[PDB]
Design a binder for this molecule. Structure first.
Ligand code: ATP
Ligand code: MG
Lengths: 39, 347
């Protein structure tokens, strides 16, 4: 690092983009698997 | 700023004893503490700041803490640094400070205009804040100095001023250990009242013990009385401003680069040091220390006015960093590390 010294702006923009655009909300099969591994 | 400065500084830089000439030109009104003269030289000239990408804050400022039992020229050192280094200010943990560590906005009295009095560090943004009696600063100043040397930006949010003034401080500090006397049995951290994260990031820790000794006390007393008789009102190394022109020249114009050091040697160095330090109650050398080692290397290359760091510079930076680490370490482990690593401290 000392000698050498996607992109940051692109990544933060992409972060805001995902957060504003999509609402992820799991499916029932995933919920049941999580139930089993939760117990 | 001036011209012929390049001529004089390079002409003397040819000499190649310039490192020791600087070490003996720093702090001539003090006796002994050659380790701290050298260490403050490395702090004064600093390293380099870099940012691989826009993602990693690696700094060029070498921060120093003297910890000393009383009456051993800590404030004398600090006032020398204030005198010599441009963009220096002084401040104290106590309330008698000329300039304060915290940032505040008010109506400044002598002008009665509503200033943003940004604190001591920000006012010393390029160069040095000097914290005398670093061991008693109020908890607000603890918060502020911690956030300064960690973030390197002071985040003010008082009235409506929700801003962040950048503070690229190069903090020097002085601290009196608990009980007014250094205790070699306990470690540095637990015999100085500075908490772990604060004591960590200081690039140099130095210990100042006032060990009674015949020849030492004779020398010190003769020096002091000589100064006194010389400073009666009847009698009314390089010069300091020469050193200051050297300081700015080698601090801004010269950026020594590093592809010319035994990468494998230093990697195995960290390996061996940490491998020995593997133990309980033995908080080891880490990457903090290895980057401090590179900072010190760059600083010695700066000090030599070179444009390329050399094995000689790497040896000196190794020497000072390892000296600081062992003297941080308590007595028995200190002697173990000193005995097994004398080869580097030999140089
Ligand atoms: N090595 C030394 N060389 C010259 N003077 C010294 C030395 N050690 C101590 N003194 C003298 O000791 C007196 C006290 O110095 P200084 O102001 O540094 O105190 P201190 O040890 O930092 O104490 P405190 O914790 O109260 O700040 C000064 O006169 C200083 O000249
Ligand atoms: Mg003092």
């Amino acid at each position: 690092l000392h000698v050498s010294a996607i992109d940051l702006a692109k990544l933060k923009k992409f972060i805001a983009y995902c957060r504003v655009k999509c609402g992820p909300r799991l499916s029932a099969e995933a919920a049941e698997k999580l139930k089993n591994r939760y117990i | 700023l001036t011209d012929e400065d390049v001529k004089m500084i390079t002409s003397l830089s040819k000499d190649q004893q310039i490192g020791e000439k600087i070490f003996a030109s720093i702090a001539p009104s003090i006796y002994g503490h050659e380790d701290i003269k050298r260490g403050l030289a490395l702090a004064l000239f600093g390293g380099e700041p870099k940012n691989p990408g826009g993602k990693h804050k690696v700094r060029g400022d070498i921060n120093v803490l003297l910890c000393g039992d009383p009456g051993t020229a800590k404030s004398q050192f600090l006032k020398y640094i204030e005198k010599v280094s441009s963009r220096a200010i002084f401040t104290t943990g106590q309330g008698a400070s000329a300039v304060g560590l915290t940032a505040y906005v008010q109506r400044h009295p002598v002008s009665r205009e509503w200033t943003l009095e940004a604190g001591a560090l920000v006012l010393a943004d390029r160069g040095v804040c000097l914290i005398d009696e670093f061991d008693k600063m109020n908890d607000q100043d603890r918060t502020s100095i911690h956030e300064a040397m960690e973030q390197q930006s002071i985040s003010i949010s008082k009235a409506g001023i929700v801003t962040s003034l950048q503070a690229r401080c190069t903090v020097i500090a002085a601290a009196n250990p608990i009980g007014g006397r250094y205790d070699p049995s306990l470690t540095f951290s637990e015999n100085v009242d500075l908490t772990e994260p604060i004591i960590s990031r200081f690039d140099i820790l130095c210990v100042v013990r006032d060990t009674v000794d015949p020849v030492q006390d004779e020398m010190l007393a003769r020096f002091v009385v000589g100064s006194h008789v010389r400073h009666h009102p009847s009698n009314k190394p390089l010069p300091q401003e020469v050193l200051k022109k050297y300081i700015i020249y080698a601090k801004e114009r010269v950026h020594p680069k590093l592809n010319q050091m035994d990468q494998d040697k230093v990697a195995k160095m960290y390996s061996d040091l940490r491998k020995e330090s593997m133990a309980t109650g033995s908080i080891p050398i880490t990457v903090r220390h290895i980057e401090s080692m590179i900072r010190m290397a760059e600083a010695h290359a700066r000090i030599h006015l070179r444009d390329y760091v050399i094995e000689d510079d790497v040896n000196m930076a190794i020497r000072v960093m390892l000296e600081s680490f062992i003297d941080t370490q308590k007595f028995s482990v200190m002697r173990s590390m000193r005995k097994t690593f004398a080869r580097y401290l030999s140089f």
